Amino acid sequence: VSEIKTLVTFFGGTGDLAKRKLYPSVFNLYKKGYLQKHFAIVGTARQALNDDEFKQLVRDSIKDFTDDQAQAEAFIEHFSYRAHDVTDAASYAVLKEAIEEAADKFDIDGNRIFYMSVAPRFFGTIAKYLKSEGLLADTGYNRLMIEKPFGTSYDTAAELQNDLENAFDDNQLFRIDHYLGKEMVQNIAALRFGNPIFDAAWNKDYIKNVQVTLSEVLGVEERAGYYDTAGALLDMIQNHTMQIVGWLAMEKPESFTDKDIRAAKNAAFNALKIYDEAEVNKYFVRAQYGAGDSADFKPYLEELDVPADSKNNTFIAGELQFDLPRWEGVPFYVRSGKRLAAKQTRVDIVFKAGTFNFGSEQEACEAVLSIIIDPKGAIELKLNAKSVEDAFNTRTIDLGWTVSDEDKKNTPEPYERMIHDTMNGDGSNFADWNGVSIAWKFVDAISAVYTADKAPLETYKSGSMGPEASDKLLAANGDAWVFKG
C-alpha cells in the first residue's frame, strides 16, 4: 500500500472524542500500513502536559486495539504535545514551533491537516489565526476538519464559511457528518450507476416516490439542554437527512471524481423548492412525543431540564420537491424522530406499479428497493411474482441481502474513513458549501414558521412511527410509508 505523508494537529487533543475515536482511528491507518515513517501527530489543548505525559494519554487510548506492543510503541513515538490557548494570538507561535519541530524530526513537507475538536465558537478564530500566525504549510496541502455543527442557521453558517475562507478554499474544508462516512450510504451510487436496469429507472418514469427514514427508539435522555433548542429539524434533518437525499437525487455524474459527484449533487440541490409559510404547513409535520406504553415512557414535557412550556419538535416528516426533469412530480419523503417504533436509518424507493393486466384478482403492486443503513446493512428488492394458487394471480416476494460477518469486520469505522479520505484529499463523501448553504435555506424557512408558531405542533404515542399527520402527508399523493415499524 502507498505511504501517506502527513502532519496532523488535533485541537482539543485531550478531549474525549480524541481519546475514544480520533486516536484509535489514526492507529488503524498505521496498522494497515498507510502511515509508516513520514507522519506526525501534534496534540494541543490548554492543559499543561509534556510529550511523555501526552504519549501516555495516547498509549491508554489505543490500549484496547493493541495486539503487538512493539507496534503500539512505534506509533506513539510519532506524537508530540504543546499546551495552547486558542484565543491568544501570541500562543500560536508556540504551536507553530512544535509543528515545525515535528515536520523536521520526521521529514514532512507541508501536508498539514488541522482537526478542530473544540467548541463551535472557536472554529472561525482558530482558522483566522492559522493564517495570520503562519501555521499553514507553504508546500503541499492544508486541510481543515470542522466538527459538527456547521452553523445553526444560514446566517451563522455563512459567517463561519466567510471566516474559514480567510485561510482556506472550500475544497480544503472537510465538514464532519458521520452518516456520510457510513458504508451503506456509499453503496447507493454503486447500486445506481453500476447496474443499467436501475440506472435507467432512476427517474420520474419509473419511480413513484423516494422515502428516507431515520428513527430512534430512545428519547431526549440527558441531552435535554442542547436538544430543546435544536429538535429533530436541526439535529437530524438539516445535516444527516439532507446529505443522504443528495446522493439519491443527484444527476448522473460525468465521472466518479469528487468534483463531478459534487456538480451532480448541486444540480439537484439548486432545484430544490424553498417553502413559504403556506407550503410549510402543507408539506411538513412537526410533533412531540407523549405518553408511551409504560411508566418509563414519559412525555417529552416531563423529561428533565425540559421547560414545561416547550414547543420543541422531537419528530419531523416532510415532502421535498426537485425542479429537475428527472424528478418532475416525484415526491421525496423524509422523516426522523425520537421515541419511535425501531432504531433504523433506511431508504425506500417505490417504483410505479405496472399497467399490464393479468386479468387476476390481485393486480401488480409497486416494487420496492430498500437500502437499510442502520443497525445492520441490508438491501431488499420487493418484486411481483405469481401466487401459489390454482388461478393465476400476482403477489410480492422479497429478494434479500445482508452484510456478512466478514463484511462487518473489514468495514472501517466512519471516523477512520473520514480521516483517511481527508489525507487522500477525497471530497466525495463530504458536503460542500453549496450543499450546506442550500440545506440551511430550506430549514430556515421551516424553522421560521416554527419559532413564529404559525404551524401546529402534533403529538404521537411513544413507540409508534409518528403522528397521523405524517400518513396524511403521503396519502395526499396516493403514497404510504413502506416501513411500518
Binding region for a copy of itself (CB under 8 A)? 32, 183, 186-187, 190-191, 193-201, 206, 252, 255-257, 351-352, 354, 356-360, 364, 367, 379-381, 383-386, 388-390, 392, 394, 397-401, 403, 406-407, 410-412, 417, 420, 428
Residue 318 labeled ligand binder: no
How many whole angstroms separate alpha carbon 185 and alpha carbon 346?
A: 9
Residue 252 Cβ vs a copy of itself, minimum distance, rounded to whole Å? 8
How many whole angstroms separate alpha carbon 63 and alpha carbon 249?
A: 43
Residue 269 Cβ vs a copy of itself, minimum distance, rounded to whole Å? 22
Residue 210 Cβ vs a copy of itself, minimum distance, rounded to whole Å? 15
Q: Which is nearer to a copy of itself, 175 or 417 (CB)?
A: 417
Residue 382 labeled ligand binder: no
Q: Please, after which residues is the chain broken with C–N above 2.5 Å?
A: none
Q: SS in 3 state form for 29-55?
A: HHHCCCCCCCEEEEEEECCCCCHHHHH
Q: Which is nearer to a copy of itself, 291 or 397 (CB)?
A: 397
Residue 15 Cβ vs a copy of itself, minimum distance, rounded to whole Å? 26
Q: Which is nearer to a copy of itself, 59 or 352 (CB)?
A: 352
Longest dimension (CA), the chain: 85
How many whole angstroms separate alpha carbon 290 and alpha carbon 339?
A: 9
DSSP string covering 237-268: IIIIIHHHHHHHHPPPPSSSSHHHHHHHHHHH
Phi and psi at 232, nearest 5°, equal -60, -30
> How crowded is residue 440: how many other Cβ atoms within 10 Å of its Cβ?
23
Give the DSSP letter of residue 389: S
Q: Which is nearer to a copy of itself, 226 or 392 (CB)?
A: 392
Phi and psi at 357, nearest 5°, equal -90, 110
How many whole angstroms separate alpha carbon 9 and alpha carbon 115?
A: 6
Residue 400 labeled ligand binder: no
Residue 235 labeled ligand binder: yes
Residue 145 Cβ vs a copy of itself, minimum distance, rounded to whole Å? 18
Cα separations in angstroms, 326 against 30, 175, 202, 205, 207: 44, 29, 8, 8, 10
Q: Which is nearer to a copy of itself, 28 or 213 (CB)?
A: 28
Catalytic, 240? Answer yes
Residue 354 labeled ligand binder: no
Q: Which is nearer to a copy of itself, 68 or 406 (CB)?
A: 406
Residue 296 labeled ligand binder: no
How many whole angstroms separate alpha carbon 13 and alpha carbon 30?
A: 19
Residue 216 labeled ligand binder: yes
CB-based contact 10:115 (threshold 8 Å): yes
Residue 288 Cβ vs a copy of itself, minimum distance, rounded to whole Å? 38
Catalytic residue among 38, 78, 84, 240: 240
Residue 17 labeled ligand binder: yes
Q: Side chain identity at 351, as an amino acid letter?
A: F
3-state secondary structure of 121: helix
What are 106's three cell numbers?
520526521
Count of positions (residues) in the chain? 485
- Positions at the binding site for NADP(+): 12-19, 46, 85-86, 148
Query: What amino acid positions are annotated as catalytic residues?
Result: 240
Known binding-site residues equal 12-19, 46, 85-86, 148, 178, 182, 216, 235, 338, 343
Residue ranges for the known binding site for substrate are 178, 182, 216, 235, 338, 343
